[PDB]
Amino acid sequence: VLLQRISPLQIDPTIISNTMSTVSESTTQTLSPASSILGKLRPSNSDFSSFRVALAGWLYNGVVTTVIDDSSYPKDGGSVTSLENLWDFFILALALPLTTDPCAPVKAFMTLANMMVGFETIPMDNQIYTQSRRASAFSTPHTWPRCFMNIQLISPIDAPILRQWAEIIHRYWPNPSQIRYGTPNVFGSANLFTPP
């Protein structure tokens, strides 16, 4: 509430309605992709506290971690053959990099892999966890597949769009940085592992 009441930024969700404008809704053959993402977003919601708490978690990396709700993951796995599952992949992949969770890129990669069970295959570790395990199970860093670390394990002839997805994850992920604050000379600092 403090970052909100100090921020110059206010949100109108009506920008998305301004872009789409959804002139047709009574059809029954299917839904438009525009109407589908409007119903998926529901911009009539005006609660945005999760954005502020996700911003707040950067102060508190050390004791509390910010992960994504599994209800926002595509249920039952989800294939790429389905429109709203593709939209849910877009929502998750766009929302992800603001979190303090460490294995977020591996979540992003296995989300597309589980979207693409049965069309493009990746190499395996053993016959325990197959390709179609959920992305929600990836929390610790002992569950990252070796094909995710080494780019050359995904051959660019059987899984092309998976190869380029992992490529874009590795090259285009936002790097960390640092700034400073306060004065240590007449304050001290409660910094423990960072410089003070």
Partner: protein, 148 residues
Amino acid sequence: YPISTYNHDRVNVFVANALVGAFLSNQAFYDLLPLLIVNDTMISDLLGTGAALSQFFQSHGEVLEVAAGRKYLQMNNYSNDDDDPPLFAKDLSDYAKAFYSDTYEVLDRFFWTHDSSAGVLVHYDKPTNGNHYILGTLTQMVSAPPHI
């Protein structure tokens, strides 16, 4: 594929045989097509599959199963005469199954779990496409009149 660039490059014999078989059987060979020229090794292209084609070959975690079939082919004028040459049940659909892999230790660790009811045959000298085994099935030879 042009001949000039691919003058002296290798192939998978498995991909070649399954390619001509899928072309004769009209079973959408084009996904099998770009896996023709082999990579650095012989079998890793089969393990990391381009498209899984279990009608021709399936993977089992460092052990490749293939269905070698039809060494011979019967013509319709063959009528099981004793003066006619034998066929040794090599003209049926799938007389046996072959398990190509790297090492006999890994293959016997696979045979710990695999069935071995019909017996297993090896070659031990100079195999056709790498070290493997033979798993015959319950199809029988008829062309000998007293013995089956």
